[PDB]
Design a protein around this ligand. Structure first.
Ligand code: ZN
Ligand code: ZN
Length: 79
């Protein structure tokens, strides 16, 4: 994050909107995203969603069951 970028991107991931002036952004979120924010699962295959913060947390619990290592042979990290 050495330097910033032009325009101001939206918060929502799917949205993918950009607005030069901030005023517009806030208005866009208050208008388009007027609705209440939501929580999505960080898993692609899961594609689950929860309208409650607690729900997401508890949901993850299950996933936890499966553990993994940041490092792997298949893809040797270099640099
Ligand atoms: Zn947006
Ligand atoms: Zn999930």
């Amino acid at each position: 994050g050495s330097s910033g970028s032009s325009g101001m991107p939206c918060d929502f991931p799917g949205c993918g909107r950009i607005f030069s002036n901030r005023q517009y952004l806030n208005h866009h979120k208050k208008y388009q995203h007027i609705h209440q924010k939501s929580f999505s699962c960080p898993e692609p295959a899961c594609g689950k969603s929860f309208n409650f913060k607690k729900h997401l947390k508890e949901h993850m619990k299950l996933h936890s069951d499966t553990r993994d290592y940041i490092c792997e042979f298949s893809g040797p990290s270099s640099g």
